[PDB]
């Protein structure tokens, strides 16, 4: 992508304002629960003003940063795509569970991811990407060997390096993996997203193995969901104690959220603190808490520690 000037930033500002106006329509009924695009876009705008404020005068180094260019390009694409969603989705935008409506929700999730990534690589408006400290040491060593001190890398290169260390069986597996790790949906992989994924499916030594057993084949996996959606889904098993599902939170990237019904029965949530997910699932199953994945009678034996 081309070097970022203040002009293009102002253009993205205009597009974001347009999307905000399109979402401010009264007939849309905005659910305040995340992702809330009417809060996302302004926060992105304000953080962008912070980055520009700290890099005022020295705009030369800010416009040459590879991640900032990729981010601004992605923001351009996503905002423009949202405008197109409203444009070619006339009446259907004013419904429930509609195609452009669900697409708008998904794009909102993307905006949330991009805002989190932006605040992560630019904390307090100052760049902190070439100064990475990935939570998992093994994953950080892999990134250090493969891409060195680069903040972001193209998806193809990441797939190559990952396949060198962790073999990928099929292109389908690579696609599903891509849909899982590429949160900003820009065909790129940042150190931020890499940290999130490797924290999610720890340990590193059996990364793709955990991902196949926790995400791909485990019927309890629900990807990104809202607490209300978890409640509404587990509601069909409020009479079947032990039934559980786990999700990802757009407000808490890198951590799992296990929802389970009790013997009363109430629906409760548990967030493991730097535990491998399968460890918490095994422990919970042996204690009669996590018995039925998505209500299914058979729970996956994850005793492959």
């Amino acid at each position: 992508p081309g070097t970022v000037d203040k002009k293009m930033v102002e253009k993205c500002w205009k597009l974001m304002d347009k999307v905000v106006r399109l979402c401010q329509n009264p007939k849309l009924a905005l659910k305040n629960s995340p992702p809330y695009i009417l809060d996302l876009l302004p926060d992105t705008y304000q953080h962008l003003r912070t980055i520009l404020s700290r890099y005022e005068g020295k705009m030369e180094t800010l416009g040459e940063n590879e991640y900032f260019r990729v981010f601004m390009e992605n923001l351009m694409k996503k905002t423009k795509q949202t405008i197109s969603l409203f444009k070619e989705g006339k009446e259907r935008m004013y419904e429930e569970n509609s195609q452009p409506r669900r697409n708008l929700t998904k794009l909102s999730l993307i905006f949330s991811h991009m805002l989190a990534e932006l605040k992560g690589i630019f904390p307090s408006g100052l760049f902190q990407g070439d100064t990475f400290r990935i939570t998992k040491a093994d994953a950080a060593e892999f990134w250090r060997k493969a891409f060195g001190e680069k903040t972001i890398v193209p998806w193809k290169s990441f797939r190559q390096a990952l396949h060198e260390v962790h073999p990928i069986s099929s292109g389908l597996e690579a696609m599903a993996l891509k849909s899982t790790i590429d949160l900003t949906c820009n065909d790129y992989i940042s150190v931020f997203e890499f940290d999130i994924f490797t924290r999610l499916f720890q340990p590193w030594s059996s990364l793709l193995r955990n991902w196949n057993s926790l995400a791909v084949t485990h019927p309890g996996y629900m990807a990104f969901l809202t607490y209300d959606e978890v409640k509404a889904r587990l509601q069909k098993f409020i009479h079947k104690p032990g039934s559980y599902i786990f999700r990802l939170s757009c407000t808490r990237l890198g951590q799992w959220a296990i929802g389970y019904v009790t013997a009363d029965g109430n629906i409760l949530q548990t967030i493991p603190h730097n535990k491998p997910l399968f460890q918490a699932l095994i422990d919970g199953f042996r204690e009669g808490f996590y018995l039925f994945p998505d209500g299914r009678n058979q729970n996956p034996d994850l005793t492959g520690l």
């Binding site: 696609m175 849909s179 065909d187 485990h218 996996y221 629900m222 990807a223 990104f224």
Partner: peptide
Amino acid sequence: LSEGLRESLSSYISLAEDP
């Protein structure tokens, strides 16, 4: 077997630049 990877894969196919 699949479950919620279906949702993310469907979203990906429907919204990304693809393949």
